[PDB]
Amino acid sequence: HPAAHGVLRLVMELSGEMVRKCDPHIGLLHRGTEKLIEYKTYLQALPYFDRLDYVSMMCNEQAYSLAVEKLLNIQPPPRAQWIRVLFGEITRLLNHIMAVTTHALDIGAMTPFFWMFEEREKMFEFYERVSGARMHAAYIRPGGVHQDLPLGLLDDIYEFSKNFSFRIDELEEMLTNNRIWRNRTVDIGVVTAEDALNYGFSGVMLRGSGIQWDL
């Protein structure tokens, strides 16, 4: 299904078109990553985390590296830390572009998808320049980062960041004040703060519900 992201089986009971219950059937992309990680070493298990949330790859790598370094009782050098934070924010930009554009595409709007995916292509070029892999970089590792930046990467990242707020503005021109988008999204999926905290939501769910929390 185009809206089911490929590997979700949503068994739904409908009275007419009203949804009476949702029974998400997951596991269609269960691979046994944890068992395989048990069978690999610590360096061999890094690409597994690279492939878990394949839209925030360096973020997954950073989480795994932080855990392993905490267990090892070591500290990454300051330049490695700054590179980690920079690429974590670049990864956040990639992920949020993907999220917003795919959400708008399931709604019915596709031009923002194409524009922001051109931007995603440029950020993929940054990933490939540092790591040699366009997405699954395996660049952030326990102890720092694998290799140092090439001698033009910072200038090109500056150019990209310089010309990106205009892309976000063009994205907002099509969605923010559009009455069709407001009708489709306003008062849909309202979740209270107590419900979010009990159900275990984190990040944008909590912040949208109004809880002031950020790791």
Partner: protein, 176 residues
């Protein structure tokens, strides 16, 4: 610190009320979206003319594998099995024995390119720069068996791509 994404209230003066009513009756923001798409229509497309044009790559790119040689023609690999040990997916099968001249050389060196995850650990673990991940990425086949490379295939890839592989390694060997 924090900021409120949506907590503004509209003014109730007559001019603002009339402006909102005009926006409701006359589809102002809808026309605005139309204008944005028209602007993008008149902009320049961002499409390359593949296959006559190629996207940029870097000396660090990890593509098809290759086994290199010394400038004298001798194979660099010494059957040390570090790449086989470090391979995350266990895609490398190596078997070795003393050669006729007594060298430590491989008799079997297989890489299952359907099992490889193209992570580049093997070229990091190699102490003699024998196995590398070349710049080639257009090597799709029509049968599964053709993706099960062996030593002859990898040596042929190395001999075919040696110039570009050497150039990439020269460019990027100071960062390693």
């Amino acid at each position: 610190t924090y900021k409120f994404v949506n907590m503004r209230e509209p003014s109730m003066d007559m001019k603002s009320v009339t402006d909102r009513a005009a926006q409701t009756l006359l589809w102002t923001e809808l026309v605005r979206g139309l204008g944005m798409t028209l602007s993008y229509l008149f902009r320049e497309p961002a499409t390359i003319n593949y296959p006559f044009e190629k996207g940029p790559l870097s000396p660090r790119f990890r593509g098809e594998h290759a086994l290199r040689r010394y400038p004298s023609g001798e194979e660099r690999c010494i059957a040390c099995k570090l790449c086989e040990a470090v391979c995350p997916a266990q895609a490398i099968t190596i078997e070795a024995e003393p050669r006729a001249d007594g060298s430590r050389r491989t008799t079997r060196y297989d890489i299952d390119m359907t099992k490889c995850i193209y992570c580049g650990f093997c070229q990091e673990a190699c102490p003699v720069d024998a196995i590398v991940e070349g710049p080639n990425f257009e090597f799709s086949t029509e049968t599964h068996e053709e993706l099960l490379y062996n030593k002859e295939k990898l040596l042929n890839n190395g001999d075919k791509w040696e110039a570009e592989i050497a150039a990439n390694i020269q460019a990027d060997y100071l960062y390693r």
